[PDB]
UniProtKB/Swiss-Prot annotation:
Keywords: Antiviral defense, Cytoplasm, Disulfide bond, Host-virus interaction, Hydrolase, Immunity, Innate immunity, Isopeptide bond, Metal-binding, Repeat, Ubl conjugation, Zinc. GO terms for biological process: base conversion or substitution editing; clearance of foreign intracellular DNA; cytidine to uridine editing; defense response to virus; DNA cytosine deamination; innate immune response; negative regulation of single stranded viral RNA replication via double stranded DNA intermediate; negative regulation of viral genome replication. Changing E62A: Decrease in cytidine deaminase and antiviral activity. Changing H60R: Nearly abolished antiviral activity. The CMP/dCMP deaminase domain 1 mediates RNA binding, RNA-dependent oligomerization and virion incorporation whereas the CMP/dCMP deaminase domain 2 confers deoxycytidine deaminase activity and substrate sequence specificity. This is DNA dC->dU-editing enzyme APOBEC-3F.
């Protein structure tokens, strides 16, 4: 029900930095929450899981998560709402495989909260991410509330608050503007 291993503060600031560079990288840490529900009936939720997975030499973190989740999952009569905090929006490869997973598991919906964007100026990537955001995933840029939530629940904070780095707000604003253009259709 809780398998969190809290990261260091500096590990958190390293892997969730949000300078909106152009790069093809893949998240190392993937922090996740799993909520139940059922029919579904209005009003959330009841938490059943919170934890993290790590990239492995031949497996991006997103795929290790699908692996773990399908090794767990049982009640096809409940509906699952999954949240991820990741360093980057996923791969084209992972985008494709996530669309596949979502088509195989229609009781599941996924929210991806990313510190910044995977190579945001390739058009096939942008349109692939758009397609995924209507295929049963929500994609969003991590903002101050999600950085605070992450700090509170996945970081060895030891009572310090999260202190934003230089240009935190400009970085976020650009990322959020860009992602809303990508998702606009
Ligand atoms: Zn794979
Ligand atoms: Zn990937």
């Amino acid at each position: 029900r809780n398998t969190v291993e809290r990261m260091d503060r500096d590990t958190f600031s390293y892997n969730f930095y949000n300078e909106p560079i152009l790069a093809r990288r893949n998240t190392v840490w993937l922090c996740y929450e799993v909520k139940t529900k059922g029919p579904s009936r209005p009003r959330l939720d009841a938490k059943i899981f919170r934890g993290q997975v790590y990239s492995q030499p031949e497996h991006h973190a997103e795929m290790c998560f699908l692996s773990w989740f399908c090794g767990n999952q049982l009640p096809a009569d409940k509906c699952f709402q999954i949240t991820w905090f990741v360093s980057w929006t996923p791969c084209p490869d992972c985008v494709a495989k996530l669309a596949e997973f979502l088509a195989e598991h229609p009781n599941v919906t996924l929210t991806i909260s990313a510190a910044r964007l995977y190579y945001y100026s390739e058009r096939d990537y942008r349109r692939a991410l758009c397609r995924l955001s209507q295929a049963g995933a929500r994609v969003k840029i991590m903002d101050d509330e999600e950085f605070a939530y992450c700090w509170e629940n996945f970081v060895d904070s030891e009572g310090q608050p999260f202190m934003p780095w230089y240009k935190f707000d400009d970085n976020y604003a650009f990322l959020h503007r860009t992602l809303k253009e990508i998702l606009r259709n």
